[PDB]
Design a protein around this ligand. Structure first.
Ligand SMILES: Cc1ncc(C[n+]2csc(CCOP(=O)(O)OP(=O)(O)O)c2C)c(N)n1
Ligand SMILES: Cc1ncc(C[n+]2csc(CCOP(=O)(O)OP(=O)(O)O)c2C)c(N)n1
Ligand SMILES: Cc1ncc(C[n+]2csc(CCOP(=O)(O)OP(=O)(O)O)c2C)c(N)n1
Ligand SMILES: [Mg+2]
Ligand SMILES: [Mg+2]
Ligand SMILES: [Mg+2]
Lengths: 557, 554, 557
């Protein structure tokens, strides 16, 4: 005999997921009971929203599938933001949601009567209800197959309460369904590889830019090797920063491409799983020039040439493309030109921007955000996972995070939902309890999930939560003040409360840092503690980060 | 010329809503700028989830329309729980959600690419996106008309960013819900219902949420007093019936009558067969009884039990028509005092028996805490209930409290809705007292709203009964599966009083039942947001927890 | 200045679509007005249902994108069956549907108040509403990109009337958006190709089976070559029959694999864009053995191992795989084993089945269906397009269609929606007016769209509609009689009406065939006429096609 919950855990075991995140409820308890016997670990949270965000962070940091367990009704609805965030971010998460019993369907009963699949459908690759317990292993396998393959994304499986508690015979409990984990991925053809490498060799000022989809299929090694073989500068968005960071050819976030002169602009750009959008300054061309020869490799043809003309488009796996290109570039008969002058100009461009912003900083009595984020970047150990939340907070960190020796940098996606950081950091920590996890967040955002400090305490997850407190919803205040004037700032000031105070009351290490000098030592000690820590950093609200201009009007200086 | 933000505030003003709840964002700012110029009040929160819940409580306590302002993307999605809660609870809330700019539609831009209307459609009476700025007054009025008329429910209007910032010429007035006539009982129907009532041996009235919407209870109390019929209700309807001497409190009190004493006629005023009625089991409303059901949705008539007569009309208007005719009823009304005395003996006997059977340990008994709270709340105050075991225990004492409105869990039963609900309920009337009775697990959802209350001057008294666990879920595991099977339900960490203090609120801990009532009294007199952490015992099983699990409450 | 209708016609021109199908209305009329000026051809039909099916058939026979134009309200809703059909069949059709004006939204006006995007969403790859006329070129290009790349499928674009009638600058018309026509497709990697060929050479009894996604790409030449190099028997489902037919290694429909002995069953199977489903007898193994080594190439990982365990899975374009595999197979160092004995046994099985089923025919007064479809198969010209409708009709045609020299055989997909044939052939005919198009349909199915005889006459589309008239809803009648008994036959008999009479009244050539000897001569003359023709063949109801037993559960024999 096997219950439906047993069937769920067994399939999750076969998929090699060690942790799931949820809040217990009677509808979903059969999964928890199975996890107790099979000694599968479920980390409970204080909001189901952060249970989903934890699965996201677990997936993003672990380079694995993430699983969230949601009970019926409000258990599901509280997770919708995480589903939406994973949807836009191309993140592989499986959401398991209990539902009302089918046998008493339409009885106005507890936590029932909500079409959870319909709510989830617009923001999932697949949302389906499992109506029979025997279907459970096969349908979860299909869900995982969909979620884990490009473009990655969330899947919702709704399992009614009486389907979860129903039983099947041990024979069906043991048959093996296809998880696609060893399925061969869309690679670049021989003819395509020669065309791409040919144009690259012919370029005067070529650049590679990587995106999330390159990371989700361990394309980092291949892309770095290809960049190093060809000597092409490597850029990326936040989701791929860890994939490119190790390469000497790495130049960090692609926002650094701004500022080149008219002749200096890149003539050829090869995109590895990056979409035209917020990260590229849309099709404006300030980062990726419209007159440049753009080579786009993405798993969804809807992205090819979306906002900008592209010279060549490939509908394939960006990770496999890098490997195929790296292999052929090694034995490339013509050899590769010396791009040292091009590389040096970009290094002067990127390093100049860091230097100029630091020089231009105007200091008041409170800590300058540029000084704070420089402190954090210079202190985080090699191989660290850094999570970024808050708006002005993450915009400032974007100037220094490229210098940090990070395994993964988890920042805001297209949804740009403030508050996702704490839950995300929690799940990233559950990926490796040994590895350091630092969350840099704003004072407004951290308020979304204050109770999650208790979850980290009870689960033993030593995230260091660095709160840059400007005493406001910062960027929203800036938008009002800069665009409409200082008379128009309204409903954005947060001049109350101690976040270190809240975290301490919830059992975590808590410290305040009003002095820039005390930041780096305090962070160093926080990492050594092996304890959940909140560092409240009192910073100035006034400084406008360079990237803040881009989003309102570009032209950042 | 007026911006779309101005048009929203203009219609909200004509709709007679003075407070809105949201978190500001760049997409929705046109509304905030209009509110600043118009001196319209927007209360900011720490989570858009509680911005939505504030609108529900503002609506539920205020007997008015509630309005939530949600910015694009995560702003909207964070409120989905509130929409779903209002959906099942039949609560009139207008959710206004910004969206991406239409001019840069499908550009992978900020907070965009989400079909907010499709996401909201299954849990709203109406979900629609406004594509042109000129349509705003007419479409908002349509939304309000839908939201405010029976059965009440949430409506979502999605307004793209470039629609909000667009302008129109100043040149009319659109029809909102108010002054519409509602479905009353016909003259023939009134006589048939009243005729059967006079003939009844043991008649009972039960009121539901839809009676409260529309000020039904004044009429319902009179009719119960005129006919001498015992008056019952669910939690949303408790305040409507509470004042009547014919009131017997929450309808769970009907359990326990013997087979002959069992009620013979039941008239439902806007209450649905469901969790509140123990579905069609008959333990509260007997299946053998002649049931007369008055609801606005024919899908509700006889859903789980046979009904003798069903009317699709407005329950508030039904009470008025019936009360008028009962006053001049030629035959007169029989003396039900023996039946009422039996019911009073039943209800009060239960309160006393539960108090007697209490097993006390070193920590505060949950029955003692809610008895203290009920006897301490001022008259006409709003009491909000969250947590599972917490609200289930409160169900035994809340009827005796002199409460204006009792805001408890609906069918969604989503733990965490309490704080936002209480915050918005307080914004309805800042002077009148609001007490939230919540569990330790539930209050963790919205801990940061203590900061919102401080900045907004909303003096909610948050009473946290702390059992150091997600209580009812632990009980379900322990009672059904055994004590070895309890897993993922224990919360033996943290000080919620400590958390509130760090956010600027009044904070106190209560370890002895003797100090509870005095402490609550100061908190109410303080005029400050207050958190009272009451350390209570986890073990005692509230009687209603068995009904949720399996019939038989004792 | 350009109207929105001009923009839509201009993009369709760039996508190289010469024909679109619709029914005129005031809402969508600007597209018709722009097409009149630009000499873009719109074929009107008698039902929007067949306007959609015409776009499907045009796309399937034409190996191109199909476009259907629907006016607001009922115009859109009448096409829903066609959208669902393309959805399950993986057919690339772009549906452009007008809607009510945004300026009079929610005014209870004509043909308005219907959420056409919401209705289409469950049955489309993308369903979207165009709110501003400026977005028109970019959104259509995105729509086309989604529709044309694997897995192909339908896309719905909703354009409000007042957006269509709105105007934009000429410069906006000049800019070119990406139609993905030269985007490169997911190919097999060098490592991947080596693994597959290695297993193929080692196989004792390998088979290739092709599916719809091989034909949407140009994989037939590469697949036939690969089959010829390696000597591997080639099979397919109906949508790929035309892709394999030319090869001497082709053995026709994959249903012909049934009946081999346990030792004889294939040990290795390579699937090229075919899904486990109705075409494969699900995961039953009667066609594709469950213990066989299966290599599956599909565009969606949700299909990999859906109903059967697979040895190897590739998420790529099946057409590109055939090309990569064919190139390496040619120069395969080991060479290829002599599969002569395996080929002879398969030919013995396939040809033996044809002779046996014909031999087993018991004839009554009316024409036997096996003789009728044998005549049709033996008479249709080379390079002909055959469309199949009706139930028992298409099941019988399955026994002979493999022998017909057809360029494309358009038969029922998973939807199995009776009535699609007439519209499909109409659009299939519009692809190439010179090429012959023969539709073999049942009496019930042809009743769905009798008025399209008027469309074929007026448009000059000379479809030959052969109606196999059993005077009943055949397969449903058989299901009642076979499972429940002859007394339980109810609501399935159609003993009335002359379909030849109807076609004649609508201006088509009409002939009745009561004697099998006249069938082939009549078809030859009808094909030579160059006029729309209806041939009503009075056929026997009694004979049960072998495949009907499989559709019901049991074996073919
Ligand atoms: C869920 C959600 N609500 C509202 C917004 C709008 N918004 C963008 S930035 C910002 C301010 C964030 O303040 P804080 O977390 O203190 O960070 P800071 O900008 O001050 O560094 C807000 C409210 C959003 N992005 N997401
Ligand atoms: C949103 C949501 N998540 C989870 C549940 C499942 N659930 C029912 S009761 C309960 C425990 C509530 O704990 P607390 O608020 O401390 O109240 P107590 O039962 O301890 O009195 C939980 C998690 C739910 N009903 N709603
Ligand atoms: C749209 C649709 N409606 C109904 C059916 C059910 N159905 C399956 S076969 C069949 C009979 C078809 O009769 P006819 O077209 O005369 O072909 P025959 O089986 O007689 O050869 C019917 C009604 C269907 N498959 N599709
Ligand atoms: Mg801040
Ligand atoms: Mg509790
Ligand atoms: Mg027939």
């Amino acid at each position: 005999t096997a219950t439906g919950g047993e069937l769920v855990i067994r399939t999750l075991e076969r998929a090699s997921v060690d942790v799931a995140f949820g809040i217990n409820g009677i509808h979903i308890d059969s999964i928890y009971q199975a996890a107790l016997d099979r000694s599968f670990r479920i980390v409970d949270t204080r909001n189901e929203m952060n249970a989903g965000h934890a699965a996201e962070g677990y997936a993003r940091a672990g380079h694995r599938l993430g699983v969230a367990l949601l009970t019926a009704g409000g258990g599901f609805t509280n997770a919708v933001t995480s589903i939406a965030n994973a949807h836009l971010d191309r993140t592989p998460v499986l959401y398991i949601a209990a539902s009302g019993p089918l046998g008493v369907d339409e009885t106005n009963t507890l936590q029932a009567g909500i079409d959870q699949v319909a709510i989830a459908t617009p923001i999932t690759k697949w949302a389906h209800r499992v109506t029979r317990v025997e279907l459970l292993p096969r349908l979860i396998a299909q869900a995982i197959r969909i979620a884990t393959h490009g473009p990655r994304g969330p899947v919702l499986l709704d399992i009614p309460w009486d389907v979860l508690t129903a039983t099947v015979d041990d024979a069906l409990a043991d048959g093996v369904e296809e998880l696609g984990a060893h399925a061969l991925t869309a690679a670049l053809g021989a003819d395509a590889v020669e065309r791409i490498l040919d144009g690259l060799a012919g370029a005067e000022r070529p650049v590679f830019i990587a995106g999330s989809e390159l990371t989700r299929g361990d394309g980092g090694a291949a892309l770095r090797r290809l960049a190093e073989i060809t000597g092409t500068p490597l850029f990326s968005d936040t989701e791929a920063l860890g994939a490119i960071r190790e390469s000497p050819l790495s130049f960090g976030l692609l926002q650094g491409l701004f500022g080149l002169d008219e002749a200096e602009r890149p003539d050829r750009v090869v995109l590895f799983g990056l979409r035209f959008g917020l990260a590229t300054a849309h099709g404006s061309g300030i980062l990726i020039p419209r007159d440049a020869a753009v080579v786009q490799i993405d798993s969804d043809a809807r992205e090819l040439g979306r906002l900008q003309p592209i010279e060549l488009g490939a509908v394939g796996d960006p990770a496999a493309a890098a490997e195929e290109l790296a292999r052929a570039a090694l034995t490339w008969a013509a050899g590769w030109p010396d791009r040292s002058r091009w590389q040096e100009r970009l290094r002067e461009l990127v390093d100049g921007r860091f230097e100029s912003v630091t020089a231009q900083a105007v200091r008041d009595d409170r800590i300058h955000p540029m000084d704070a984020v420089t402190a954090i970047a210079e202190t985080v150990p090699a191989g660290s996972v850094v999570v970024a939340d808050g708006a002005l907070t993450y915009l400032w960190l974007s100037e220094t995070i490229s210098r940090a020796p990070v395994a993964d940098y988890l920042c805001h996606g297209y949804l740009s939902s403030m508050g996702v950081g704490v839950g995300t950091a929690l799940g990233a920590q559950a990926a490796d309890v040994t590895r350091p996890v630092v969350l840099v967040t704003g004072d407004g955002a951290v308020g979304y999930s204050l109770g999650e400090f208790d979850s980290m305490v009870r689960a033993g997850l030593p995230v260091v939560v660095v709160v840059l407190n400007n005493r406001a919803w910062g960027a929203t205040l800036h938008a009002q003040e800069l665009i409409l004037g200082p008379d128009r700032v309204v409903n954005n000031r947060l001049e109350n409360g101690s976040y270190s105070g809240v975290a301490r009351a919830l059992g975590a290490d808590s410290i305040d840092v009003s002095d820039i000098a005390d930041l780096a030592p305090t962070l160093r000690e926080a990492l050594a503690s092996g304890r959940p820590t909140c560092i409240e950093v009192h910073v100035s609200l006034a400084p406008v980060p360079p990237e803040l201009n881009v989003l309102l009007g570009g032209k950042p200086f």
